[PDB]
Structure formats: structure tokens, C-alpha cells
Amino acid sequence: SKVTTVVATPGQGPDRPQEVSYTDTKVIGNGSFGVVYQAKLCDSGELVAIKKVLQDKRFKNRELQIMRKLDHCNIVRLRYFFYSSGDEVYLNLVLDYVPETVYRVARHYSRAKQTLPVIYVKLYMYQLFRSLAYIHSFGICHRDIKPQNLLLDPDTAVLKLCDFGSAKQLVRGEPNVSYICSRYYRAPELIFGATDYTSSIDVWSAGCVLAELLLGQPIFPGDSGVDQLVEIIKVLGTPTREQIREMNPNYTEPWTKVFRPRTPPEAIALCSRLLEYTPTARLTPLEACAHSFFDELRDPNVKLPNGRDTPALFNFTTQELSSNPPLATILIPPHAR
Amino acid sequence: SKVTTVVATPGQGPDRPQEVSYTDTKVIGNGSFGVVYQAKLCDSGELVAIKKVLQDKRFKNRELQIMRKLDHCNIVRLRYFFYSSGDEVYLNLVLDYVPETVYRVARHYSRAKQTLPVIYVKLYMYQLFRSLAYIHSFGICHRDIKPQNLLLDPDTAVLKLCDFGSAKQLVRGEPNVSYICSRYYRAPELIFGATDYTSSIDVWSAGCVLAELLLGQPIFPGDSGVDQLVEIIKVLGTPTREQIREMNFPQIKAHPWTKVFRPRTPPEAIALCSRLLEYTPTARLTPLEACAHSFFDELRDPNVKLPNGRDTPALFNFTTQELSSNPPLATILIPPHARIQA
Ligand SMILES: O=C1NC(=O)C(c2cccc(Cl)c2)=C1Nc1ccc(Cl)c(C(=O)O)c1
């Protein structure tokens, strides 16, 4: 059918635009400040997604700047970006296409009264943590970690983090808005309105995703900040004054009984280390990958339930390990090339 | 059949302990910080609600203290309150029982593609505003105005505000937490984390309820603070710096509200919405000023009746306390035929 041709700029490297053509354009949903479509590149016949947002024009788009700077196997990649109109100027990001979301998958198991096999919970959570160790190493915080922003390829078990419309370089000393991050996944300090939060808010969110995958429903639900805190308190106990001071300095004023009996002790151990009141006490993304809960992924014989091999899991780079190099000794198993 | 008898304290009358007996304790759902049961009073065979919450001896119950001082035709009345067993202490509040909530009713119309007949939108919204004018006159802010806390009697069209588990006396100068209020109904200043907010946050919430009833769905939805703001901006335009300062993004302009609602929607309803949903807290109408808005002129008509043939509920029995906010408004709030000597 219809073929659109544009002059787009590659996401990485030399700023040397090239002609790009795509076809079969259908709307595939909705993201942050725009609309995501799916289309097929004519040259390679490969499927891609195209996010499209209105552009300020006398202002540089922050999502685009953060994206042109990332290259990781667990993050959707910016392939190109170009401008289009409708006066109104539109910015178009040409990203990797991924068929499913962790959201929709978990829901399937949920209404069928089934619980996602723990092997997948491991594969998915591990990859999310690698992606976080990576962007954090650049001082970037996603600020919207929730199941809906976790894409999955069903057959390969590869997971990619997406939607960077809320991502931001967090600089010690500068303040940041506290109204970011979706309900159920917001870290306590965000609920208490803190504006001096660090990247550990992403870890709390990830902790909520893990717990949700093991539980079969959100662990800290609530229509208001108050309700959510009541849920959090029911599990982490009441915050000591010291703990309240470390989340937000301007306040105003078991863990096994939580999950079914089958659930592995490691999973619960990891949860408790992620979901902590004190921001500095939560594990770092990298420290999480090296947690025993992921030891099965480091087994040489591990395979997917469909018979296939696991995705790339050990191809760590120096950038990725910068957070804490000595961890390579665990992160990279003996057999791994 | 089982029967429970307890010695409770009247809700407002002088402290003369009364023996109360009830039967049929059945669960009706979750109220903030507790569970609410339904029960039938033995004698009158009248239904009541009983909100049971955990009472930690360290402090006195703030919801209880607030409700004991309240008595208005559009607010749930605290009939009696007594303590009970559990190894913990449970505070029990015997409240008026009302069969439906605005949430459930707007929902039936919603998942069937119809909107609530405007006459009902008027009756319900007006009563909500009276209830707000009243508690605000005491300096109390509900802080959780949403469809689920708006009870309705189907036959009489009477509306009662409930769930005061978040209500608080707001004192100029003292700070207040900003994580109160349910998503979709939070005023901008709350989203921006403000801690010096006034009772006008209840008005913003009420504005969201009105818009929702006219629209058939929430007017400012969003899973995050950011999303909600984008929705608010799409309609109120971008906040000027001055407006941001009084409260404490891809710039968009003023959105003619009429584009927002269905065509057929009354100009008065839209006018009222715009005057309620304002960035500047001090610019939003007061509860009382809202009741006197032209959108409610039909309720002041002497011939007005309910679609089921019945008369409208009490709407003009205003008290001095209620009007304290601005006495001169009585001249409009109390229509002529409501002044005819008996
Ligand atoms: O294949 C994709 N690459 C992407 O970058 C995204 C994506 C997903 C969420 C937000 C943004 Cl900004 C982009 C894809 N998919 C997508 C887009 C919108 C929706 Cl609404 C859904 C979905 O939930 O199914 C998936």
C-alpha cells in the first residue's frame, strides 16, 4: 500500500541524515506525550515503532537527547528521528518494535488464576536491573518504571525498557519535581513530596514489579497517597523518625506472610532488600543482578521452557560495571564467553 | 436469630449512655481506615451503618471528634459511638445508612452510554455544595471528595457526604500533608506538593465530580501527577508564572470549555465548571457562592418536581452558621416562595 519516505537522522553516531522508507502504518497504542505507531521499513522489511510528539521548536526535546546517548540490549533503541508537520511541528522517534508488555502478560496469568513461572520472573527482573544499572551509570533516572513500560518478545524472553518521556539527568544539589512516577510504583519519598530524591526511586519501582509478578496483583495499591502508605506500612512496619528524615526532611505527620507458600526464599529476600524506607539502603541495580535469586540464570544448562537458549545476559561492558567493578566476578559466570 | 446489645454514647446529644440493640451484622465494604457493616436496629427495624476502626490508645480519634460536632441534612449523621473488643480496641461509629453511592449510579449510566439526567446533576451537586459550605464554615476540609464518598437515596434524591477519615481542621500557618485526596480529583496545588493549601481543594474536587457527571467519565485522568497535569493543561491552558506561584511542559493555550462537553450541555453548567476548576486557589468560587450560581436556578423554581413526581428535598433551610461565610447571599439562596409567612 502507501509508502512514506523521510530524511531521518541516525540515533547514534555521525549526524548524517539518510533517506528512510516505511509502510503498513497502524496505530499501536499510546505513550507519554504522544502516540506510538507501528510500521515496516521497506529496505529491511523489519518492524519498528514510531513515537510522535509535538515539538516546542525553540527548545531541545529532552527525551531525544537522552535517547541518542543510549545503547543497551535491554533498552529500546532509537534508530532514527525526523521532523514532520500537520503549522505545528512534530518530532518522530523511530524505535525498536517489541510485541508484548510485562503488563499484558502478567494480566493473562492473573485472570486465568495462574502465576507466571518463576523462571520468567527471574529472566525479566534480571534484565530490567541490567537496564537500570546502565542508564543510572550515566546519572539518568527513568522515573516511570511500571509493567507497561517493560516490553517483551515472547519467543526469546528478551525484555526492553521503554518510554523515556520522564527520564532525567539527576544532579546532586538540583531539585526535581515529585509528581512523576505512576501510582502503586512510587517510592515513599515521592509520596512524601521529596524533591531531593536519587535514582533509587527506580529500584523501589522495580521492587514493586517483582513483588507484583510473584503475588499476582500490585503489592501497594491505593487511590490516594494515604492509602498507598497504609499498605506499605502494613508490610514494612511503621517508619522510625530516622527513616522519615532520610526520605523527606520536611515531613508533616512479616515478609513471608505476604507471598504464597511456594514462592522461593530468594525472591522474598530480594524484595525486602529492594523495598526499603531508607533510599540509601536499597540494593543498587548491579547489586540486584548478582543476588542469589538470579543464580539459576547463571547455570550453564539453563534453557527456556520452549526449548530455546536464554538471551544475552552476561555481555557486560565497563560502562555497565562502573558502579562496582568487583561484581564482575559473579555477574560473569565461569562458562560465559 | 442473633442479637447484639451495647451501651453507646449519643452522637451529639448530651452524654446520656443508651442501650442499643441491633441484628444482621453484614459487611458492606471498605471505608477509609476500616470496614463498614450494615445492621438493623431491633426496635425500629431501621438500618444503620457501623464503621469499625482500630483505635490506638496513644491518641484520640480525629474523625470522631470532627463528626461529633457535625449535624447537617446532607452529611452522614453519627448516631452513637462505642468501643469494642478484638487483643486491640475497636472504635465503632453508628452512622446513617444510605443505599447507593454516586459512584455506582454514575457508573450504571456510564457503561450503557447514557449520562445522568441534568436535573439530577443539579440536585446532587447543589447538596454537595451545601454540605461543603457547612463543614468549611467550621474550618474543616474533607480532603477526599470523590463520587464514592457521595451517598444517595434513589427515591428522595437526597445526597449525603460521608467518610471523614481524612477530614482536618485547617489552620492558617500550620502545614498539612499533600498526599491526601484520590487521583483524578486532586487540585493542582496538591499535585505540585503544596503544604499550605486551603479548603478550596474540596471545591476543585467537587468541580471534578460535576464535570465527570456531565461528561460520563473523569475529566482529568492519569496514572501519574505528570499525566494528570497534561490533562488539566489541555483544558485550562498553560499556567502563567503568577498562577504557579499561588499554587506553590509543552505550552498550550486556553481551551474553550464548550469543546469539552457534549453539545446540548447547558451553558450554565460549563460556566460553573470553569469557575470551580481554576489554577489560582483564591479564584475558585466558595461553596456558598456556588449554590447561588445560575446553574441551580431551576432548583429555586417553585414548581420544580422530581422526575418521579415527588417534591424536591429540603434545599433552603439554611442556618446562620451555614451562611456565615457571606450572609448577603441569603437574598438569592432563599427564594421568595420560601419566605412566605405561615
Ligand atoms: O514497540 C514499542 N516500542 C516502543 O518504544 C514502545 C513504547 C511503549 C510505551 C511507551 C512508548 Cl513512548 C513507546 C512500543 N510499544 C507499545 C506502544 C504503545 C502501547 Cl499502548 C503498547 C502497549 O501497551 O501495547 C506498546
Ligand SMILES: O=C1NC(=O)C(c2cccc(Cl)c2)=C1Nc1ccc(Cl)c(C(=O)O)c1
Ligand atoms: O451507608 C453508609 N453510611 C456510611 O457512612 C457509608 C460509608 C461510605 C464510604 C466510606 C465510609 Cl467510612 C462510610 C455507607 N455506605 C457504604 C460503605 C462502604 C462501601 Cl464500600 C459502600 C459502597 O461503595 O457501596 C457504601
